[PDB]
Amino acid sequence: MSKFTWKELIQLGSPSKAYESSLACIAHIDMNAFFAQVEQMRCGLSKEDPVVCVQWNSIIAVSYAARKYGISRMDTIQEALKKCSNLIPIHTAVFKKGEDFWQYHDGCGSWVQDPAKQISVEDHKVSLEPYRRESRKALKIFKSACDLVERASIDEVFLDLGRICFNMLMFDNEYELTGDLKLKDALSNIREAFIGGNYDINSHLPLIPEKIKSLKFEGDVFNPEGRDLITDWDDVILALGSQVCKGIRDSIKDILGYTTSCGLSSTKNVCKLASNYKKPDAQTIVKNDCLLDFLDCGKFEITSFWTLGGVLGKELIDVLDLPHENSIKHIRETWPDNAGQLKEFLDAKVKQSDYDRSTSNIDPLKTADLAEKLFKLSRGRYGLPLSSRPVVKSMMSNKNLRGKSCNSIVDCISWLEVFCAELTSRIQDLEQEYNKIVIPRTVSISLKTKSYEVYRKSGPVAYKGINFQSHELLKVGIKFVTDLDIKGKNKSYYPLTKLSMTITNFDII
DNA sequence: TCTGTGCTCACCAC
DNA sequence: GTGGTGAGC
Numbered sequence: 001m002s003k004f005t006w007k008e009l010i011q012l013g014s015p016s017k018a019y020e021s022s023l024a025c026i027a028h029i030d031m032n033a034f035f036a037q038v039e040q041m042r043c044g045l046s047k048e049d050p051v052v053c054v055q056w057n058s059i060i061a062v063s064y065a066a067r068k069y070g071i072s073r074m075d076t077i078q079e080a081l082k083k084c085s086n087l088i089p090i091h092t093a094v095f096k097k098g099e100d101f102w103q104y105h106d107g108c109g110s111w112v113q114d115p116a117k118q119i120s121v122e123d124h125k126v127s128l129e130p131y132r133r134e135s136r137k138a139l140k141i142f143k144s145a146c147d148l149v150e151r152a153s154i155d156e157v158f159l160d161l162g163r164i165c166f167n168m169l170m171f172d173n174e175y176e177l178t179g180d181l182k183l184k185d186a187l188s189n190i191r192e193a194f195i196g197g198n199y200d201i202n203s204h205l206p207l208i209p210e211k212i213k214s215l216k217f218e219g220d221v222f223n224p225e226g227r228d229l230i231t232d233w234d235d236v237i238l239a240l241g242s243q244v245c246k247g248i249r250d251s252i253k254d255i256l257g258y259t260t261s262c263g264l265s266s267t268k269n270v271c272k273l274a275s276n277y278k279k280p281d282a283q284t285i286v287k288n289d290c291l292l293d294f295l296d297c298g299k300f301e302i303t304s305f306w307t308l309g310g311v312l313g314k315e316l317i318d319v320l321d322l323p324h325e326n327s328i329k330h331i332r333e334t335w336p337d338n339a340g341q342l343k344e345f346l347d348a349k350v351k352q353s354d355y356d357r358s359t360s361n362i363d364p365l366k367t368a369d370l371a372e373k374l375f376k377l378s379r380g381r382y383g384l385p386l387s388s389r390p391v392v393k394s395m396m397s398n399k400n401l402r403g404k405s406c407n408s409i410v411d412c413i414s415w416l417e418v419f420c421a422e423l424t425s426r427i428q429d430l431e432q433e434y435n436k437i438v439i440p441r442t443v444s445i446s447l448k449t450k451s452y453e454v455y456r457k458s459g460p461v462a463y464k465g466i467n468f469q470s471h472e473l474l475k476v477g478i479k480f481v482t483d484l485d486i487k488g489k490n491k492s493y494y495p496l497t498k499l500s501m502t503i504t505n506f507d508i509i
Numbered sequence: 510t511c512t513g514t515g516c517t518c519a520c521c522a523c
Numbered sequence: 524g525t526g527g528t529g530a531g532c
């Protein structure tokens with residue numbers, strides 16, 4: 001008999017509950033050196049070209065070819081050039097003050113000797129739109145290939161591979177395990193059993209068939225301990241996932257040119273670590289059996305977990321007297337029976353004045369949740385559902401001003417054109433994300449004076465029509481900046497040190 | 510193979 | 524209400 005029940009297997013077929021099954025097959029896919037690849041691709045360059053994406057004098061993304069020279073985000077452009085003279089730095093696109101479009105100034109930048117070809121920080125604003133556009137393309141590819149996709153960030157997704165896995169397992173007559181061997185023949189038992197319907201759902205699954213063990217994982221399977229690859233149905237699901245996953249990743253590579261790193265496990269949190277384990281263009285598979293091996297390999301700490309890499313993670317180091325090293329094993333070793341034992345410990349720790357509820361990130365009421373979470377996380381069995389992102393509350397386009405650039409109403413107005421164009425662009429990236437029409441009803445203009453005093457005017461934006469139009473947003477912005485200018489006469493004001501436009505009260509009609 | 514004249518977003522103590 | 528801040532790119 002198998003460790004797993006029919007109920008846990010069948011649940012993969014359900015988007016709502018697939019993640020809760022210990023048989024969950026989840027993937028985390030992260031674009032390698034994302035802005036550098038998008039610039040590489042746009043400029044017709046190879047994967048092995050040492051390109052660097054730059055903002056002013058900083059490096060914001062470093063291609064894996066560039067990293068062979070010890071270049072990193074830490075280096076300034078000039079520094080990175082001393083490591084590799086053949087470096088290809090590419091500035092992000094920029095808005096020019098007073099223009100409503102961004103553009104690329106190729107062969108320009110602070111590293112370029114010629115004074116003619118610079119991108120002055122004083123007169124320009126970075127646009128990340130090209131990276132947003134590319135991310136959106138990636139997203140349409142992922143969404144086409146998988147019925148539940150979470151957009152974790154601009155270059156990251158989670159995929160719930162449940163349906164695909166389950167359906168491939170049960171109904172896929174195409175697939176070849178080997179020459180003269182197919183899935184339908186290798187899995188005839190469980191497939192006949194499933195259609196048969198004669199199982200009780202809490203009945204355990206039949207033992208995997210010897211013939212299934214020839215099923216190949218795609219990518220790098222992390223078992224330091226040389227465990228057997230396929231011992232149970234979870235390993236069958238994960239292996240099927242890995243194949244499905246490579247194909248999706250090859251899609252991204254073939255349509256858009258981007259390499260990715262990918263983590264495959266039964267859990268999001270573990271997927272996130274695993275995608276990051278090998279870069280670039282690698283798939284890391286972590287089987288449930290190798291979970292402990294993986295978490296204990298020495299690269300990870302309590303602090304590695306998502307939402308525990310912040311101050312809350314620190315408090316947990318202090319509040320559980322955690323070792324600086326091997327803290328994952330530690331937490332599992334200290335409370336090996338159940339969430340309860342650690343919950344109680346937290347409660348006991350809380351009361352003695354080792355801390356005050358003024359600077360604390362730990363909620364006493366919901367202390368169980370924390371204990372379940374850590375207990376689960378430490379064994380790599382804490383499964384969160386994939387979710388969509390919260391609707392957008394506000395969008396701001398800002399410029400921190402240096403110099404005397406903003407010395408007048410017309411200067412402001414020139415910066416406003418840029419903010420307004422950028423915001424208009426971003427409304428659209430959202431209209432396409434939501435496939436619904438999105439209009440902001442309120443605008444706010446803010447500025448900091450020469451002496452850093454804040455001025456702000458906030459109000460409704462009138463549309464002479466049903467459709468949002470950029471020029472209407474600008475018009476209200478102009479009025480507000482004009483009113484604020486009047487407000488500041490004979491007071492510290494110009495030259496300004498900051499100016500921004502924030503939209504809010506989005507109607508998602 | 511963390512960082513600064515980065516950039517943005519959301520939260521909640523004052 | 525929001526500036527300072529925390530967090531994430």
Ligand SMILES: Nc1ncnc2c1ncn2[C@H]1C[C@H](O)[C@@H](COP(=O)(O)OP(=O)(O)OP(=O)(O)O)O1
Binds near residue numbers: 033035
């Ligand atoms: N500290 C930062 N400053 C500016 N831009 C950043 C920073 N961190 C990330 N970004 C931008 C540029 C990155 O290409 C993109 C995605 O971030 P991230 O995935 O962490 O790194 P990456 O894709 O550049 O490298 P990796 O291959 O390690 O994922 O977001």
Ligand SMILES: [Ca+2]
Binds near residue numbers: 030032033034155
């Ligand atoms: Ca990345």
Ligand SMILES: [Ca+2]
Binds near residue numbers: 030155
């Ligand atoms: Ca990332």
Ligand SMILES: [Ca+2]
Binds near residue numbers: 003231232
């Ligand atoms: Ca097992």
Ligand SMILES: [Ca+2]
Binds near residue numbers: 317318319320321
């Ligand atoms: Ca302590």
